[PDB]
Every structure is written in C-alpha cells, then in structure tokens.
Design an enzyme around this catalytic site. Structure first.
Site, PDB file in Angstrom:
ATOM      1  N   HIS D  73       0.827  -1.193   0.000  1.00 55.99           N
ATOM      2  CA  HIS D  73       0.000   0.000   0.000  1.00 55.99           C
ATOM      3  C   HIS D  73       0.866   1.250   0.000  1.00 55.99           C
ATOM      4  CE1 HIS D  73      -3.801  -2.187   1.738  1.00 55.99           C
ATOM      5  NE2 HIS D  73      -3.476  -2.583   0.521  1.00 55.99           N
ATOM      6  N   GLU D  75       0.882   3.927   1.771  1.00 54.19           N
ATOM      7  CA  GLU D  75       1.336   4.420   3.065  1.00 54.19           C
ATOM      8  C   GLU D  75       2.620   3.716   3.501  1.00 54.19           C
ATOM      9  OE1 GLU D  75      -1.819   3.530   2.032  1.00 54.19           O
ATOM     10  OE2 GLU D  75      -3.199   3.871   3.697  1.00 54.19           O
ATOM     11  N   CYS D  99      -6.012   1.601   5.829  1.00 56.39           N
ATOM     12  CA  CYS D  99      -6.446   0.337   6.409  1.00 56.39           C
ATOM     13  C   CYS D  99      -5.732   0.134   7.760  1.00 56.39           C
ATOM     14  CB  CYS D  99      -6.144  -0.823   5.461  1.00 56.39           C
ATOM     15  SG  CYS D  99      -4.395  -1.339   5.434  1.00 56.39           S
ATOM     16  N   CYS D 102      -1.859  -0.528   7.595  1.00 53.44           N
ATOM     17  CA  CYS D 102      -1.124   0.718   7.418  1.00 53.44           C
ATOM     18  C   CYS D 102      -1.190   1.578   8.684  1.00 53.44           C
ATOM     19  CB  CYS D 102      -1.611   1.493   6.188  1.00 53.44           C
ATOM     20  SG  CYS D 102      -1.172   0.732   4.582  1.00 53.44           S
TER      21      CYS D 102
HETATM   22 ZN   LIG Z   1      -3.120  -0.117   3.837  1.00 55.45          ZN
END
Ligand SMILES: [Zn+2]
Ligand SMILES: [Cl-]
Ligand SMILES: [Cl-]
Ligand SMILES: [Cl-]
Ligand SMILES: [Cl-]
Ligand SMILES: [Zn+2]
Ligand SMILES: [Zn+2]
Ligand SMILES: [Zn+2]
Ligand SMILES: [Zn+2]
Ligand SMILES: [Zn+2]
Lengths: 160, 159, 157, 162, 150, 142
Positions: D73, D75, D99, D102
């Site tokens: 992801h 992040e 999420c 993260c």
């Molecule tokens: Zn994430």
C-alpha cells in the site's frame, strides 16, 4: 483471553542485554557488558570488553601480569562502555554490569549520557572508581545500583 | 582467551529470543534482531500492540465470532517493530519465518538476508508468498542451527 | 601562494589547541572526511560540565587523584565525541597515545596525520602503532610547506 | 495560487498515477513540521518485484494468483521511501483513509496526523480497527475538504499566454 | 493515465510552481537522487519572512531585486550527484548553485530565453563544470488531478 | 590567554580564506550551530572542477560555498559583509545571525540591498570586534 502477567519487564531486559553481550567476551578473567537506552526506551548502543575492531583475540595478549607491560592486555583492551558508545546518545542511560572506571566516565560524560545504572560496584574504594564518581558528580551524571526482580533469565531456543 | 564464549550467530538469535520475552501475547512470543554489515545491531523488535495502545482494552484471543475481537487486526509482528526501531543491506534474525506482509516490509526496508529458527508453517500461503517475494527481490534466507539449546543469564555472576 | 588542504586541516588542529584551558599543555585535533569537510574538532581539557576551576591541573602530586591525569580528556577523544566518522582522517599535532588509538580504531577513522612523534619509543606509542597496524589504520608524518601561518583580522581592511 | 494543504494532497494524488495497479491507484505524501515533503508513496509490488511478473488481478481460483499477498500500500511505501533518520512527528496526506495494517505502520513510525480525502470504506471492519488504533495511539485524523476539486498541471503553461 | 518517472518529476516541478505568489512568473524545480527519490522541491518567490517595502530603493540600487528562484529554493530544501527537473532553463546564478550543489543533470521544459545573456552564461558554466542539460519532451501537455477520482 | 569561541570561529573563517586561489581577494566563511560545532566552511573560488580555468560571473563566494558544503538557526562568521545574492542564500538557508569582520563597502548598493533583505527577513548582523588582533599557528610548536 487476556495478556500475560509473567513477561520480561524493561529494566531487567536492558541489563540482560548487557549481561548477554558480556558472554561474547574472549577475556578469560573479566567479561563485562553495557547497554545504552534513549528517552524512548529504545537501545541505541551495546558493547562488551575486547580488543579493537580488526584486531585478533589470538594476536594480542590476554594476561594481566608480565615483565613488560606490552605483553599484558591493558595497553590494548577496550572496555564495554567504550564499545557501546562507539557503537547520538545524548540524554541516554547506560546499563552496565560493573561500575565504570574513570576513563569510561570521561567518554560517558562527553557522549552526553546522563545516567549510569550498574549491577556491581565491587571496586568502590579503587582510585579508578573514586575518580569516576567525582567526574559524574561534577558533570551532573546520575549513578545508581540496579536491583533486579530476578537473579537469572533463561533463553530457550526450543521454546518456538 | 576463553574457549567457551558466545559466538555472534547464537548471540544475535539470543537477542531476538530475549526480546520476545517482553511480549504480552499469551500464546505466541516472537522476537527479531536486525544487524548491519559491521555486525552491529541496528534494530530489535518483538510482537505486541502499537505504541500507546493498551494490552488490556485490545483483545489477545486467536478466535472469535467477530475478527475485531481477536488480536489480528491490532497486533504488530516482531519484524515490523524491529524495522520501525536506515537498515539497507542488513540481515534479520527472527525466531519464526516471516509472513508475506512482513516480507514486503523487509524488502522495502532494504534487508538482504533472513535467518530464522522455525519454519513451522512452511506450507501456508503466507510463507509461500513470502518465499516468492524474497526470491524475486533477491533476499536470501536460511535456517539457523544453534550450537546449544539454552543460554542462562545470571546477574549474580558479576559478583 | 594559497594554503593546501593538508596545511589547512593541520592549521585547524593547532588553532583548536588555543581553546585549551590547560595551563601546561595545549593540544588540538581535527577530523576530516573524504570530501574535505571538517567533521570534528577537539582540544584537551576536562569533561563537559567539569573543571569550573574545581579539578586539579597539576602533573605531579602525593597521589594521582590530586593530578589532572585521572580527569583530563585528550584532544583526540574530544574531536571524536564532538561529532559517524567512519572512513575519516584525523589530524593531530602529536602521535596519539594507545588509549586514543583504541577510540580512533573503534570510531572507524582510517588515517592519522601527525606533526610529531617525539615519544616514538614509548610503550604508549608502540602499542598505538601495533593496534593501527592490525586494524588497518595508516599513519603518516605531516611535512609542512610553511612553518607559520598568521591570522590578522585587520588584513581584510 | 495553490495553498499548502491542496498542494500536499495533490502530490499524493499525482503520485498515485505512478502505480501500475490497473484497478486502484492510491498515493500518500508525508510532510514534516516545516512543510517539507519527507516521503512519497504509491501502491505497488515490492522493490525488485515490479517487472510485470506478479499478478494484479483481484479474483482467481487460488489466492496466490491475486495481487493481495504481494502488493504494498501507498502508506507503507511512503514511510519506507524516506526515513531520513525518521518521519516522527510528521503528517501524512493520503487519498483514502488508511487500512488497519497501514495504521500499525503509521503509528510505529511516529506519525501524528493523517489527512485523508476519501473514507468510502468507513463501515468496514478494517476501518473500525484503524480508527480504534489511531484514537488509542493519539494519532489525529481529519477529512480533507479541498478549496477546488480539480487541479490541472500543464507543461505548456510556462510558454503560453496568461 | 500512467506516468513514467520523468513525466512525474516534471509534473512535481510544475505542481510546485502553482504555489508561487509571483504574478509575473511561476517556476518550479524538483531534485531527484539516483534511486528516484525526490530530495528537494522549490518554487520562485520572496525570501523567508517577507507588497514588500523599500522596493523602489532596491530597484534603483532590476525590477525583481528580492526574488528567490525555484532552483535556489529546491537546493536549500534539499544533493550528491542528483538530477534537477526545472520548468525553465536556469539563469547563471542558479547555474552556480546547481554546480556547487553537486547536481550532474538539469532536465528543463522551456528554453524560451535561449538567446539571453543569462542562459548563454548558464550553458557555458554547465559545460565547464561537466553538468549535463537536456530539454524535456512530454507525451501529453496536460495532467488532471481530480480529488473526486477516489 | 585562551582563545574564546567567537575569535576561534572568525579565525577559522580567515584561515579558510587562505585556501583561495583568487589573486584579487580572499574571503572566508564558517557556519556554526548553537552547540558551537562547525557545520560548514567556505572560501571564494571557481565552480567545482573549474579551478584550472581562466576566462578573460564565474566566481562562487565564500558564503555560498559554506552553505553548499553542509543549518536553520545557525550563525555565519564571515570576513566580509555579504553581498545581496549571498544574503538571499543565507536567509533561505535559515541562518539567524551573520557575524562579519569588515563592512568596508557599507555604502555600496550590494551591501545596502543585503541589509535590507536581512532587515525584512529578521537575520541579525553583527560587527565583530575581536579581543586579540592577530593569531599565529606555529607548526614547529610541537
Ligand atoms: Zn493499507
Ligand atoms: Cl577495590
Ligand atoms: Cl585513577
Ligand atoms: Cl601502554
Ligand atoms: Cl479487521
Ligand atoms: Zn572503563
Ligand atoms: Zn509478519
Ligand atoms: Zn591520547
Ligand atoms: Zn535563477
Ligand atoms: Zn556574496
């Protein structure tokens, strides 16, 4: 289903890292370790007593007495505190197995370490320890004896 | 010199196993240790809840009706915490083979080797995906074989 | 007639010596990386926060605790603590003692450039050379093209 | 002129266009207290694994033939793309609310603020976990309300008539 | 659509340019290292901590006596052996900063002022110091950022 | 009779100037942080790689080089009061204080523009007034 009650707490953990590191020492007569920790309770430096980097523990002498000083360990050996600092550390605490000598006290002060937590002060009456205490007092560096919750810790590799 | 001192492979894995002893997890205690090319430790981690998150409000159980009542949505693995405590070109000593999510982090951190004690879950999708990612990223891995099974730390030994 | 890099860095080490409050001996040291940036400067003295006139400066006494030797920090120690230094070179007036040699090696300094080696035959100097030899740290005498450098602040006007 | 919050969110959105993910592109931007950009990320495969060998698809007979086991992801990548020492005390501008995985990274990295554009999955279990962790950890988060919804970058603007 | 690294980096420079309060010129710069990390961003404007006062006095003693260029600002926010993406070919003063910063490559969008003395002086400084400069050629002229797109 | 920090740092600035191959004039600069550590040193000269070049504009000032050679909240010690171009660099670098030895071009347009920029931006400029007039480095002292 709740958290463990029997986990290793941070003070014993940091001193245990010092004592574990000491077991790496090749010195037959003295094994000492040190561990430096910052304001976040993270380890920023670890050391044990030994010969300088690149120097063989089978090329320099380990004996404590000889006719010629150059045939003893003393001209050559690095203390645990020196190695931990050379491994900034300003506003940190040092956990050490043994109260620092005056030469280590200098490095500790110049490194900006503000607190020394020691297990043994066996040589309190020594000139070296007496000079160390005076330096720490003048520099405003705290020193205090570690009082552990337990006397021993077992690392079991088969626990996983 | 001594001929019974602690050698560096055993030492670095001992550091990971000692750190794991700090874990509040009732079922699994895992530690990891990151070491640079100078053989210096540059990061140590164990499994737990994020910083400032109480081990009393967040659940520790492994199963429930709702996944929000298990540890899995909340817990940080040892590898994550070791990395978050640069590490480019380093080696990681870990008690258990990394999961694929930890594998991602390990690669993006620039770690080049993973040394593990246990590969219990070798046939899992997580471990299988972890191996592929390491293979592709050029991260090598190998099982650690200890010179002995136990290490005792005695605070009275200095006296 | 411009000053060369080596003369400049040795000049910085000697200049730094004049910061010293030791009444008998003033010593300086300069650490430089491969890009010729000054990374640390040091001079001999008492540790940070100390001898506000409180620690002794005398060289001989009844017992050593009344002399400066248990308390004083060498220029080399202070240079290293005054800012990593891995792959750097150190400029010193005098060839380092074995205690400074340990610190230099552990700091990862790879070259020592010295003005004087007048205590060559001492145990301290000998031990230092052996350690540098084993650790792979080279050491070479500095040969100045000029013996003196004058800094006049009124030279600009 | 473009104000700084719009600018930092625009960098996050611009960075998302670097993604080779054909179904979702997300970007993230980390900014320190002096408004300097200290990390940029977008979603993608890990370093050395981006040469169009791993699967991007979302459905398959076997989970290992989807992107999910492999993808990083935005992040995660922003945090790992510069810990100039660290990103502690920094703020993250991200396209979507992070999420919970993260969230863990963001907390352990020492990030103190998350500014997000979309919370479209807010009724999710993952989102609930993320909020819980952020609130417990003391990480502030706020929905970004932009002064304008579209920003045009035009390379001709340097040469063209104003 | 998908952006390649060069288009992305030039787009960051142009995006940064939009932060400028200068009514006459909006220029941006983006400094990139060997691993495609952005190490510095700048745009043109007034010095930190600044209608600025005493402008007629400053003008008499250029029409832009106070301005700080995009390239100067990117460098001050940063630079090893990096590349700089810049909207407009650098002037001679910025050329000196770029050379002293260790930047080995300058990728520029516009060279509107090629025949100017500043640009000529800049080209010569770069050639003396071994700094590559090359004109950037984009695919699409326009990139739209839409905050509703998620 | 020990050298105090301000004189030490201005001496380093003057020592640095002597690295200059510029035959017309030699200026030096030294940037220092609040912990009294040197974080940057500079002298005037040709751009990197161009020291063997003569071109009958090209010169980089001490202040520019000091900043490029490695500073928010720092102080700069300079042998000569900065020009307006160097003042911009000093302000954008976040330097808070310029300590100068000479201001012999005070009434010039360059120095006046510099003061104006420093005034607008809140950079403090201080005339250095040294204790000792001269300092001698003696390599034969050892
Ligand atoms: Zn994430
Ligand atoms: Cl005793
Ligand atoms: Cl003593
Ligand atoms: Cl000796
Ligand atoms: Cl969840
Ligand atoms: Zn000691
Ligand atoms: Zn994991
Ligand atoms: Zn010494
Ligand atoms: Zn310019
Ligand atoms: Zn100037």
């Amino acid at each position: 289903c709740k958290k463990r009650d029997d986990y290793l707490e941070w003070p014993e953990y940091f001193m245990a890292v010092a004592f574990l590191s000491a077991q790496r020492s090749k010195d037959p007569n003295s094994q000492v370790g040190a561990c430096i920790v910052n304001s976040e309770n993270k380890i920023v430096g670890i050391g044990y007593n030994g010969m300088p980097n690149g120097c063989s523990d089978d090329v320099l002498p380990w004996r404590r007495t000889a006719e010629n000083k150059l045939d003893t360990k003393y001209p050559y050996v690095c203390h645990a505190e020196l190695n931990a600092i050379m491994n900034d550390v300003k506003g940190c605490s040092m956990y050490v197995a043994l109260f620092p000598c005056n030469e280590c006290a200098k490095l500790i002060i110049q490194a900006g370490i503000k607190e020394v937590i020691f297990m043994s002060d066996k040589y309190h009456d020594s000139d070296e320890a007496t000079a160390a205490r005076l330096l720490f007092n003048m520099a405003g560096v705290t020193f205090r004896k570690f009082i552990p919750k337990c006397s021993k810790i077992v690392i079991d590799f088969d626990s996983i």
